[PDB]
Amino acid sequence: AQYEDGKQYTTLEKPVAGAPQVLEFFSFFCPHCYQFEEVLHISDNVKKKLPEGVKMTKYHVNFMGGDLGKDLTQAWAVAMALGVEDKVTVPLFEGVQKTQTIRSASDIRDVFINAGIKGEEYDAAWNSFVVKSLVAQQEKAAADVQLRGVPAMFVNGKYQLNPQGMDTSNMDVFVQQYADTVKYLSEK
Numbered sequence: 001a002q003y004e005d006g007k008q009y010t011t012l013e014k015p016v017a018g019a020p021q022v023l024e025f026f027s028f029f030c031p032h033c034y035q036f037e038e039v040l041h042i043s044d045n046v047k048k049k050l051p052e053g054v055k056m057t058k059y060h061v062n063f064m065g066g067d068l069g070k071d072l073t074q075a076w077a078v079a080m081a082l083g084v085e086d087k088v089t090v091p092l093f094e095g096v097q098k099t100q101t102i103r104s105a106s107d108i109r110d111v112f113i114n115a116g117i118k119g120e121e122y123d124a125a126w127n128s129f130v131v132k133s134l135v136a137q138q139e140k141a142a143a144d145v146q147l148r149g150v151p152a153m154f155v156n157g158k159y160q161l162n163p164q165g166m167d168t169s170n171m172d173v174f175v176q177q178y179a180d181t182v183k184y185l186s187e188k
């Protein structure tokens with residue numbers, strides 16, 4: 001078959017119920033995640049191949065980067081709460097992996113300030129129980145699939161994308177195979 005378990009995707013032994021339709025996990029410390037955002041735009045290209053209604057969810061993980069890694073999961077909850085993911089994703093990636101200017105929680109906050117989030121707005125959100133609950137959701141979702149590596153994408157809590165089983169001589173062909181695979185899995 002053209003799409004095969006073990007090839008473009010794998011099937012979770014214990015599938016998780018009530019999971020978001022398309023769920024990505026990343027870390028701002030994760031080198032392939034940097035590529036998936038800045039060079040490949042995986043999330044955008046997947047979204048372009050799915051129906052207009054479908055929901056895509058993207059969550060940060062704690063297991064890379066120690067204390068700053070957990071700060072970043074909380075900051076990502078702030079981003080989701082305020083709806084400013086698109087404004088902060090690139091400068092967070094570059095601050096962690098390119099310019100080495102993100103070394104503390106205050107440095108993370110600077111990125112939001114420079115992106116135009118008001119200081120009181122960020123601090124209030126950072127300390128809010130709405131954001132605490134979003135942190136819990138990010139952790140629960142990774143726990144549900146015993147997540148030990150990123151980037152990762154899961155479809156309907158049942159299938160895990162396997163990019164290592166796709167072709168990578170051509171970056172654009174790779175992205176469309178990935179997106180087309182997500183489409184095939186969503187229609188399963």
Ligand SMILES: Cc1cc(Oc2ccc(CC(=O)N3CCOC[C@H]3C(=O)O)cc2)ccc1C#N
Pocket residue numbers: 032035039040148149150151163164168170171174
């Ligand atoms: C064109 C292109 C294709 C790519 O294909 C992939 C290759 C590998 C991965 C897996 C990954 O990152 N890991 C594996 C399990 O989780 C732990 C983590 C590790 O330990 O490294 C993901 C995608 C990557 C980058 C580019 C570019 N430019």
